[PDB]
Amino acid sequence: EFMENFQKVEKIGEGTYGVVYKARNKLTGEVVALKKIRLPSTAIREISLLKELNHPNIVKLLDVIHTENKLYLVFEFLHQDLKKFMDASALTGIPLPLIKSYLFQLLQGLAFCHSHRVLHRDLKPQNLLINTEGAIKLADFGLARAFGVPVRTYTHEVVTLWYRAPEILLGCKYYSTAVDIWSLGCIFAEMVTRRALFPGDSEIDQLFRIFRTLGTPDEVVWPGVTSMPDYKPSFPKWARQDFSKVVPPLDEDGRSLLSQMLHYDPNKRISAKAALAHPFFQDVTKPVPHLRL
Ligand SMILES: Nc1cccc(N)n1
Numbered sequence: 001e002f003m004e005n006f007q008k009v010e011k012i013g014e015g016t017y018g019v020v021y022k023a024r025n026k027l028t029g030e031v032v033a034l035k036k037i038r039l040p041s042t043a044i045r046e047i048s049l050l051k052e053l054n055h056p057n058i059v060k061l062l063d064v065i066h067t068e069n070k071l072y073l074v075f076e077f078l079h080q081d082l083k084k085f086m087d088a089s090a091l092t093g094i095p096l097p098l099i100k101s102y103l104f105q106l107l108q109g110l111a112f113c114h115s116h117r118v119l120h121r122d123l124k125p126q127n128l129l130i131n132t133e134g135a136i137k138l139a140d141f142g143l144a145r146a147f148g149v150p151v152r153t154y155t156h157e158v159v160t161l162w163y164r165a166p167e168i169l170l171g172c173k174y175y176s177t178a179v180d181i182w183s184l185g186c187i188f189a190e191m192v193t194r195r196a197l198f199p200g201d202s203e204i205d206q207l208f209r210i211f212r213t214l215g216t217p218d219e220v221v222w223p224g225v226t227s228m229p230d231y232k233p234s235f236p237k238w239a240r241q242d243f244s245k246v247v248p249p250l251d252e253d254g255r256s257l258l259s260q261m262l263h264y265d266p267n268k269r270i271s272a273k274a275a276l277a278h279p280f281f282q283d284v285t286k287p288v289p290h291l292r293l
Contacts, residue, residue, distance in 0.1 A: 002067050009034065014155045016122070016140070017147055022077060032062060037071040038154045043146040047073070050142040053118055057109030059129055059139040078129035078137065079293045082187070085130055088292070090194055098287045099191045100280070102128075102136045106184055109138045110272035114177040118142050121175055122149050123183035124163050125190070132293070134286045161206040162186065162196050166217065167266050169207045171229030178266035181275070185261030192247045192254070208236070214262060215240030222264040253280040 003009055007024040014020070018036035025032060050061045060076035082102070086094065094102075106128065113120070120127075121144035130136050150159060161169075165182035168175065189197040198213070200206025211217070216237045217225045225231060243255040250258065257280045260270035270278075 002065055002072065006034070014153060014157065016150070016153055016159060017143070018154055025074075031077045033075040033077045035073045035075065037073065037147065039069065039071070044071070046142070046146045047071075050118070053113060053116055053142065055109055055112040056135070057105045057137050058113065058141055059137045075139070076137075078131050080130050080291055081126055081139075082128040082130060082136065082191075083125035085289065085291075086125060086191060086194065093194050094191050094289075095287070096192075097285055098134075098289055099188070100284050101134060101286050102130075102191070103184070103188050104276070104281050104284045105136045106138065106187075107272045107275050109141075110177070110180050110184065111276060113138075113141055114180070114272055119145060119175055119177055120180050120183070121145065122159075122163075123180055123187065124160055125187060126160075128187070130289060130291070132288070132291050134288050161200045161203065162198055164206060165266070166207065166210055166264060167228070169203060169210075170225065170231055172266075173229075176266050177271070178269040181261050181269050181272060182266075185258055188254075188258055188261070189247050192250050197246070208238075211235065212238045213241050213246055214264065217264040225264065251280075253278070253282075256280070 005026055007026050007029075009021045009023045012020040012022050012033065015035055018038045021034040021036075023032050023034045024030070044064070044066055047064050051064065054060060059078065061073065062076065063074040065072040065074070110120075118141060120138060120141045122140065123138070127139040128136055129139050152158060163183035163186045165179040168179060186197045198206060198209040200209050215221070216235055219226055226233070243250070243259055247255065247258060257270070257275060257278045260278075261275065263269040
């Protein structure tokens with residue numbers, strides 16, 4: 001009966017956890033995204049706390065509804081995601097000033113959430129939403145800690161591994177905020193080159209793609225790595241490649257920042273806060289993207 005509180009409800013897409021609708025709230029007239037979560041009291045108390053985690057680069061969580069043993073999340077609506085925008089920008093690429101603006105904004109959103117001890121864990125272009133004003137916002141922040149990250153979605157879609165940090169792949173139990181910096185570095189690279197950086201199609205393909213670009217990690221670059229649950233001494237030993245070959249034609253400011261975002265050791269990996277101070281952002285601006293809505 002909860003859908004009678006919306007004037008119209010149309011399917012947008014298929015999310016990690018359930019159907020996503022665009023909907024119009026009957027009393028207020030506001031247009032929202034409405035996410036059904038398919039199936040639990042621990043998740044309700046965790047999700048409800050995210051209503052306070054408000055920032056201009058975080059998609060606003062308006063309400064959490066638990067009814068008829070189903071959970072709905074009501075979010076701020078934005079018209080386009082970064083996946084669609086990079087597909088649409090494929091012929092020319094996203095201009096560097098707009099890549100820079102987007103990365104800057106995303107780091108501000110991470111810095112905010114990380115300062116409140118909230119992780120995303122599953123960043124990907126799909127969950128980065130853009131508007132006509134040159135803003136970009138992180139969607140679904142805090143949901144992975146509540147519900148987990150499944151292998152398959154509710155519609156059997158494969159949840160992407162492409163943005164997953166190596167410590168997760170190697171079986172580390174304790175996530176840190178560094179996992180989100182890793183994901184964002186992979187997204188940065190993809191905006192620049194117009195081709196996913198590590199498009200793995202299994203846990204080992206993901207891991208070995210990372211290794212064949214950044215080198216097989218060892219105890220010199222990552223103290224403790226050889227004691228990780230899923231580390232195997234039989235991993236092939238690939239050498240490290242130069243970022244100049246990996247993300248041309250990025251500059252030495254961008255290549256330096258990307259390298260810090262893709263450090264193997266999560267304790268070495270740059271923080272969102274420190275990344276905001278990087279010389280790459282000295283000339284940052286906020287351009288207008290051309291959006292066809
Ligand atoms: N359009 C849309 C898609 C996902 C999340 C949100 N907030 N809005």
